[PDB]
């Protein structure tokens, strides 16, 4: 009856909001600069929000758009103080390098000699370097040039920075909060029944791969399938395994790095030669586990296309080399693995010993993904290379009998695969409500 | 006892969440948000630091001009215009959560903030006249 306004400070009410997220990390230097992040609390406080049901929309999330610009800016920051390789854009005299091997695999790597500047501006030098075939083009004789010379400048990565992803934790400023959808069968959109709040997200490695998602987070039940319009064939389907299907990759050739003084203070790191055999870089994935895991994807794909329909896996249908292959980084080199042996299967309405092998090629001059004029030279890695990782998801694409083929050269699809359960909200701690209280 | 944690009673009833206000109060200027380097992460953390003190001081300034400095629960002299909400006391504090309450009171929250503002300015004018003797 007699009711007055009463003010409350610190009431549990929040609103959807965009804000700048800083980085937390655990205790040389990597491109992700995780040494500059605030140390993660060893006790990552998670608070459960009983009786709370929040709306989510992983396809409008700003955390992925913020991480997308962050990682690009981190690479930009890491390549700033390094060496410009514009003197390397010069006429190359190249020959095939040894190993009179299987026909048309000797051109896959080349032995190239060229005239290079020295520490004295007026005195040239004749040096040589081993270059992969994908990093050079012909002139039309045996003359060549670096692949990037007509489109982009090139900057070699400072060889002391590690390309190995370190787990990043994204945090919200004071007065904001991160909400996590703890729904074990969460689509990525809609009212999440189970919700908790966290100061910082879990550890997320900034792994940029294609087709196959590597070293990611696993679902706890079944195997979810996420698109914003699954009935639309132009929206990439993001699948997420619950079991990790392992993959072993290697560059067996024992390379040597040869430093070349191209100027005062500037040194270009060439590929010296190969100690021992010249073999083929490749990846192994157990044929048994990949068939089982490729079947779980089929079961969940059925719920969107019918218990009776037949779905088929085919290989990529063209595009740039990064998107037609399982491209990734391994021990410092950038592999490009043919995946026709992974998506060549037709499944009806209703091995066990060996594994399937994937021939990978290797690039050193890799181009920027959504920009032109900027390109990076990855320095040669010495020794034998071998990395072991799990495939925890895919990036598929429907054509519109159903046929699914991989792809996806958009970095923020990688970040969606980890940030789907997180959402940023701002706290509004002021609340007014009536009660029979009166001042004085 | 209970102690649900930060925002732990966001789904609870307004009367139940209203007893654990200090839980949300202390987390409005801390978090984990020493040299100032202007790296890609360093700029990000600086913005996170300035932003928190900004949004914190806006709320404290409102509590100030309302006469509710340093209070988590202050009572006022603005009567409850039933056109804001014709709900009764029990069907609010023992039924609604602060989130769904804020949803339906949101239109008039600016009207209420003005009445609280001038109620305090007229109140401080009266207290001066009373102490003038």
């Amino acid at each position: 009856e007699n009711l007055w306004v009463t003010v409350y400070y610190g009431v549990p009410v929040w609103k959807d909001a965009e804000t700048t997220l800083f980085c937390a990390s655990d205790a040389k230097h990597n491109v992700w600069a995780t040494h500059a992040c605030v140390p993660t609390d060893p006790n990552p406080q998670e608070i459960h929000l009983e009786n709370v049901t929040e709306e989510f929309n992983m396809w409008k999330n700003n955390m992925v758009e913020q991480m997308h610009t962050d990682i690009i800016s981190l690479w930009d920051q890491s390549l700033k103080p390094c060496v410009k390789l514009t003197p390397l854009c010069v006429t190359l005299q190249c020959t095939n390098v040894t190993n009179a091997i299987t026909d048309d695999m000797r051109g896959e790597l080349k032995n190239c000699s060229f005239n290079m500047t020295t520490e004295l501006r007026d005195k040239k030098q004749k040096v040589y370097s081993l270059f992969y075939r994908l990093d050079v083009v012909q002139i039309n004789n045996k003359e060549y040039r670096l692949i990037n010379c007509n489109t982009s400048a090139i900057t070699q990565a400072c060889p002391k920075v590690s390309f190995e992803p370190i787990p990043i934790h994204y945090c919200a400023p004071a007065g904001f909060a991160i909400l996590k959808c703890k729904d074990k069968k969460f689509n990525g959109t809609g009212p999440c029944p189970s919700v908790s709040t966290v100061q910082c997200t879990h550890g997320i490695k900034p792994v940029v791969s294609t087709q196959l998602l590597l070293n990611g987070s696993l679902a706890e039940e079944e195997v979810m399938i996420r698109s914003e319009n699954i009935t639309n064939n132009a929206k990439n389907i993001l699948v997420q395994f619950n079991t990790p299907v392992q993959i072993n990759c290697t560059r067996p050739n024992n390379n040597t790095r040869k430093s070349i003084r191209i100027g005062p203070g500037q040194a270009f790191y060439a590929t010296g030669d190969i100690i021992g055999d010249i073999r083929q870089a490749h990846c192994n994935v157990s044929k048994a586990t990949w068939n089982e895991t490729l079947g779980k994807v089929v079961k969940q794909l059925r719920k969107h296309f019918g218990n009776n329909t037949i779905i088929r896996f085919a290989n990529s249908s063209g595009g740039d080399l990064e998107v037609t292959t399982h491209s990734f980084n391994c021990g410092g080199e950038f592999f490009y693995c043919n995946t026709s042996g992974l998506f060549n299967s037709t499944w009806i309405s209703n091995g066990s010993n060996d594994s399937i092998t994937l021939p990978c090629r290797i690039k050193q001059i890799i181009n920027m993904w959504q920009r032109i004029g900027q390109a990076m030279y990855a320095p040669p890695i010495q020794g034998v290379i071998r990395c072991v990782s799990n495939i925890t998801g895919l990036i598929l694409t429907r054509d519109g009998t159903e046929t699914f083929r991989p792809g996806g050269g958009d970095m923020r699809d990688n970040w969606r695969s980890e940030l789907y359960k997180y959402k940023v909200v701002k706290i509004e701690p002021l609340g007014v409500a009536p009660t029979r209280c009166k001042r004085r | 006892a209970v102690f649900l944690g930060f925002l732990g009673a966001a789904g609870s009833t307004m009367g139940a969440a209203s007893m654990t206000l200090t839980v949300q109060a202390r987390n409005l200027l801390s978090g984990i948000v020493h040299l100032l380097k202007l790296t890609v992460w360093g700029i990000k953390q600086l913005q996170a630091r300035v932003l928190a003190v900004e949004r914190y001081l806006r709320d404290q300034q409102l509590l100030g001009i309302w006469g509710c400095s340093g209070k988590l629960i202050c009572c006022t002299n603005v009567p409850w215009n039933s056109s804001w909400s014709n709900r009764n006391l029990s069907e609010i504090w023992d039924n609604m959560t602060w989130l769904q309450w804020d949803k339906e009171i949101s239109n008039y929250t600016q009207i209420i903030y003005g009445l609280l503002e001038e109620s305090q300015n007229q109140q401080e004018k009266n207290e001066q006249d009373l102490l003038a003797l």
Partner: nanobody
Amino acid sequence: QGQLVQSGATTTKPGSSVKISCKTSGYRFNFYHINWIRQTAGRGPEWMGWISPYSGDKNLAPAFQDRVNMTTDTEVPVTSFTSTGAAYMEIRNLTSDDTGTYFCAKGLLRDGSSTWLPYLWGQGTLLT
């Protein structure tokens, strides 16, 4: 708002056991109890029991203590404050003297001294 659509008008004979369905909309199904009330003709209205769609806890009259099975299945989020639930009613040593109209009604408030009080009712179901 709030709706509680009830099942059909079942018709059986003594000895059997029938299930009554109560399907809810327009409100969070977990926040309020579900009450079962009986309006027989040869007696005054009888409160049978209520059950907690959140805690699973149940409470019924001694006249139904070992004769009735009250159950609910988990709700389905529609929006932040709207879900859809269901409540089930069963009788054991059933005769024909239990004939009448059966209602389902949700609780009144989420806290206080009248939490479970049957506030919003269904349209009822005729029986044997």
